């Protein structure tokens, strides 16, 4: 089995600059790659065959070259409509060999520092009356995706019990936004007073809080 | 032209037997060699299986050998991967595509691997504080709470919302099911006047929660 | 394929065509009433020989000649008469110019209006009539068209005149050019077919060939070129091999796949090659994958 090393995992550009991924097989492949296009929701999108020629349809923009076992994928001037994950495939013997793929390199849209607008929802009494609290944090449209999200309950930090979500990036402003659910029995809710979410991001730190005897 | 489409996929618990199905259509089957390629949920491509009906070979992955068998029927234009004893880490969306540089793909079809029991979504309201806290702005929500399997589709005031809104990818729990939530924002000056009713649907229980997310005191 | 020999609408009035009644009969007037121009009304002369001749229309290479006339009528008995106008026309091989000879014009059907009459001329009433016939086999260089009136009020519009041709078309990998469509119902024009580049007739088959009817249609293809080896069928022309493809024979098949153990192929290939090592049989063809040397 040939092993297809893509690197890097992510990287983050604007509109306009070129982009180069590389693709480093652990053995002699020929020619026999190819490289594809993956928008979220969609199935892959065929771009370069034989690891140097464009599919025909595909925007001349991209060009794919070789230097031994080195395969690159390259982009002139990024366009919007390019911001998907990309994979190299090879099909060395068509089929002698098991196929194997790159590990996938997400492109994203660089943009400046936005602060998460951070909410605490309380569980609702309606699902109170089924035995379990979930206690949900949001942060609405920020940049960059890195954060800390921590769960402090009567000021003990809750580690383990705590689960989150990220959107893709957004298609109007380019922000993330994230979510972490805190999930409890009813009987440990019901014995507690103080909930809050902490968001901690550089050198910064909102925390968003309520009191059972609020509202 | 050239088009690709899929079916047969579906939750099946874990050791069971499925068969999925590529029907194509604009070419030849024949003349062109075909691959099944699976997505595990998040994580990368993966290839399972691939047939030329030209030559009769038929080559498997080391993951899937003498568990997965691929077919094809040369009259109904069609090609078929048939899966038994399957286990959890087969859960993945199934892609079929034409050639080994894989130029047409189908759409996907989602196969599922647990033991699990098919539910439809329980629909709680993120009630949204009944003024301020944030600026001139709130946000309201729904939470979806464990369903099994993927997928569930959300949308707000029967689509006729959908500046501003962001629904989650779930995540599936420890207790086996999916979870997600749905929310948006909205003016707060709105909250008395505008009705806010999320409408959760989740087809693998033919079932379609509609939810009236109103504010709490 | 139209091609127009002669259409009064669009010289809009420029055409001097030659009128037999000198003036004060058949004349050339302009309405615009929408600017649309036609030529038109003397009922009560009762034995009346108004002739109207158009241009000398350049036969060229047509066979039979189609006539559109788009055209108004008035009702005869409205204004206390005939509508029956008549058309004619004329197989010369000289521009005479001012040659009103009646006596050789070999009348056309009698052109009769449908739809609606008078009427309302632009009061209470803004519809008109296409009508259209034809005329053929044309065997002079030259030919002309008459209009003939004894007694209507009438206002014609639109006159196009027009042939038939087959237009070009690449069928069956070969091309085959544009050609004069026949004038009569049994006449067939058998064309031979040119193969498309890096398209070769099949030994056991025949030429391509096409037949061009007298409506200006293709008909019953017969034989067809084929993309040769290292080359597939593309829309209708042919196109080499892509990449890791390759073409063994000269057939309808499309590029096939490079088989196991074989570097991927250049453009246009005609074989795939055996690996780094994997060997195969000299008598095996092409289109069989490689094995490997024990
Ligand atoms: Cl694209
Ligand atoms: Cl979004
Ligand atoms: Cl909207
Ligand atoms: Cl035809
Ligand atoms: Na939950
Ligand atoms: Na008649
Ligand atoms: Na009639």
Known sequence: DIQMTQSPSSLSASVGDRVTITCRASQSVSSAVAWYQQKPGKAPKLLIYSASSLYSGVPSRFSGSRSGTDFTLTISSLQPEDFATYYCQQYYGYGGYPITFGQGTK?????????????????????????????????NNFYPREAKVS????????????????????????????????????????????????????????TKSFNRGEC | EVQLVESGGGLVQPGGSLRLSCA??????????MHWVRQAPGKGLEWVASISSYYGYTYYADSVKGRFTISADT????????????????????????????????????????????????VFPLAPSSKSTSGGTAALGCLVKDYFPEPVTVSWNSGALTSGVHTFPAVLQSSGLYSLSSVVTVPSSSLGTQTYICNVNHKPSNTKVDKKVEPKS | KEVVLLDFAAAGGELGWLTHPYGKGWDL???????????????????????????????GEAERIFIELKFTVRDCNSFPCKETFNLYYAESDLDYGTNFQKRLFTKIDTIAPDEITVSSDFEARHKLNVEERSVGPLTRKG??????DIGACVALLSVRVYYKKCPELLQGLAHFPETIAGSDAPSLATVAGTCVDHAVVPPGGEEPRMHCAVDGEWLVPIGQCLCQAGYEKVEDACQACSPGFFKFEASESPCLECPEHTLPSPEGATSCECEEGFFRAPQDPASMPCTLVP
């Open chain 3, 143 to 148: 030919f002309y068209l008459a209009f003939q």
């Open chain 1, 107 to 139: 492109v994203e849209i660089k943009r400046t520092v936005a602060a998460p607008s951070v909410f605490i929802f309380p569980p609702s009494d309606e699902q109170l009356k089924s035995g379990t609290a979930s206690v949900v944090c949001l942060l």
């Open chain 3, 29 to 59: 007037m302009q309405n615009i009433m929408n600017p649309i121009y036609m030529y038109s009304c003397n009922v009560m002369s009762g034995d009346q020989d108004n002739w109207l001749r158009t241009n000398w229309v350049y036969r």
């Open chain 2, 75 to 122: 009259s109904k234009n069609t090609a078929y991967l048939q899966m038994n004893s399957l286990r959890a880490e087969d859960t993945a969306v199934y892609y079929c595509a034409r050639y080994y540089a894989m130029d047409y793909w189908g759409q996907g079809t989602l196969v599922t691997v647990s033991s699990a029991s098919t539910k439809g979504p329980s």
């Open chain 2, 24 to 33: 194509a259509s604009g070419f030849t089957i024949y003349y062109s060699s």
């Open chain 1, 151 to 206: 769960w402090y309950v009567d000021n003990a930090l809750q580690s383990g019990n705590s689960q989150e979500s990220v959107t893709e990036q957004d298609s109007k402003d380019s922000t993330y936004s994230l979510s972490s659910t805190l999930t409890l029995s009813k009987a440990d809710y019901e014995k507690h007073k103080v909930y809050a979410c902490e968001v901690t991001q550089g050198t910064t730190s909102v």
